[PDB]
Write a protein that binds this ligand. Structure first.
Ligand code: FAD
Length: 450
């Protein structure tokens, strides 16, 4: 192939200067909006950093204090005045517990009410991916079915927007997905995806297809195309799909999705993320020695891409329900402003990961009279035991520990607020003036062929 599909293919690995130049004007926040976004980003990050007054306390050595502390334990003011495989496994479960909502779906479901009382929603993810055998893919299949029954019963008719949903990894459903051929995926994967989706629809819950490595995008689009034309799903708008802004294809994937919503007569739930597999995407392309990278090489270019993609998603409310997944205070503020005045609940929502977003979003989800923005947030809730945790944890470690990540830089008390919430288009123009060209690749990440 279709016009919109050909254009996805043609953009696969297009040069970074070219990709970033085309996004720039689509992501530029109009002056007045840009400053409202700066103001709100600044506030959100301020409150975050300075939760228990962590910067005002910073506005006031250690030897002296223990002396002052022991002096204050003297009850009387006068008296005082006058005077390898097991270590990896262990560290994994220790660092990973904060990211897991529970070990079983029922345990996770029972923890749901507290944040749901306040206006949060949930998307449960049964941990596990990259099934190696037929048996593994079967076991994931049954665990997903069980999760739907349990989530659907707790949803109890609340529907796709207000009630809980499920997220699924296609790699969990087909053995050796990473290398599987088109025909075997259709004959074997598709009937399982179709079946879980019919179940989700019987309970009227959202069912989201997660995005994984970039070599898998094309086939996920093929599976999506078919799923949207199932007669049993006609008139149901609960199908969701994740797109990754770090990909050069992302905008073209959107033009495709918009067309698919039109032809299949539905509103798609589209989760926009920046993307979780960047380190592997870079290694992978470097080992193939291909013409270029399928993802951006500077983080700021991903930020620009997200913004451009976000405007595109917000322009077609009849065709897409955007779900903006981020922990970045600027990103959130920009979307908030970009979405225009006259918010209505079903216009869009925010999303975050369990163990990462709560502090940002306690300022966002809830009543205005309590100082919140009154915008719903859906928490993505990993569910499983220690045997299914590893790949997810490692992705969380790369995200949290990267010096370009917002969650890492918010901690960095040396970096001031204004630099943290800086507008990314303005950052790209600043780089462009300094280097002589817009959208040059990362200096330390040369093209695979060098
Ligand atoms: C509800 C939810 C569901 C999710 N499900 C998925 C999913 O299905 N698929 C998936 O891939 N991710 C998924 N994620 C993970 C998500 O992609 C990461 O949390 C997200 O990228 C972190 O972005 P941020 O805006 O919070 O942080 P920011 O710190 O503002 O941006 C972080 C990032 O920018 C990108 N980046 C880092 N360095 C570079 C660089 N040198 N060049 C270009 N880009 C760079 C990476 O995407 C990295 O994650 C999900 C996240 C949420 C909240």
């Amino acid at each position: 192939q279709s016009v919109s599909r050909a254009a996805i293919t043609a953009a696969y690995r297009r040069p970074e200067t070219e990709a970033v130049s085309m996004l720039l004007e689509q992501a530029r926040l109009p002056q007045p909006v840009a400053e409202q976004a700066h103001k709100l980003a600044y506030q959100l990050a301020d409150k975050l950093r300075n939760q228990k007054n962590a910067s005002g306390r910073a506005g006031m050595g250690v030897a002296l204090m223990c002396l002052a502390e022991a002096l204050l334990r003297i009850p009387d003011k006068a008296t005082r005045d006058a005077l390898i495989r097991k270590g990896v496994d262990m560290a994994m479960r220790l660092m990973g517990e904060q990211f897991v909502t529970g070990e079983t779906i029922a345990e996770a479901l029972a923890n749901a009410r507290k944040l749901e009382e306040k206006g949060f929603r949930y998307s449960y993810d049964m941990l596990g991916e990259a099934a190696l055998t037929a048996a593994d893919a079967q076991a994931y299949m049954v665990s997903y079915q069980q999760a739907i029954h349990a989530i659907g019963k707790a949803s109890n008719g609340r529907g796709i927007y207000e009630g809980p949903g499920i997220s699924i990894k296609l790699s969990a459903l087909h053995p050796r997905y990473s290398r599987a051929q088109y025909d075997r995926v259709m004959e074997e994967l598709y009937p399982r995806l179709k079946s879980l989706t019919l179940l989700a629809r019987q309970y009227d819950i959202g069912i989201n297809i997660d995005a994984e490595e970039s070599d898998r995008l094309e086939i996920s689009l093929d599976l999506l195309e078919k799923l949207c034309f199932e007669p049993e799903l006609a008139g149901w708008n609960g199908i969701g799909f994740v797109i990754q802004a770090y990909q050069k294809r992302c905008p073209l994937v959107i033009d495709y999705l918009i067309d698919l919503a039109t032809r299949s007569r539905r509103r798609l739930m589209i989760r926009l993320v920046k993307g979780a597999y960047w380190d592997s995407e870079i290694k992978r392309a470097q080992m193939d020695g291909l013409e270029g990278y399928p993802v951006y090489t500077r983080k700021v270019y991903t930020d620009v891409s997200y913004l451009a993609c976000a405007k595109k998603l917000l322009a077609v409310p009849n065709l897409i329900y955007p779900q903006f997944a981020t922990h970045n205070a600027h990103t959130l503020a920009a979307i908030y402003q970009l979405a225009g005045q006259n918010y209505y609940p079903g216009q869009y929502e925010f999303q975050c990961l369990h163990g990462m977003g709560e502090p940002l979003y306690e300022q966002v989800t809830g009543k205005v009279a309590d100082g919140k923005l009154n915008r719903p947030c859906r928490i993505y809730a990993p569910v499983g035991t220690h045997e299914t945790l590893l790949a997810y944890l490692v992705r969380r470690l790369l995200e949290n520990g990267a010096n370009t990540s917002f969650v890492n830089r918010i901690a960095d008390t040396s970096l001031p607020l204004d630099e943290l919430v800086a507008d990314p288009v303005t950052a790209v123009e600043k780089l462009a003036q300094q280097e002589g060209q817009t959208g040059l690749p990362h200096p330390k990440i040369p093209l695979p062929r060098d």
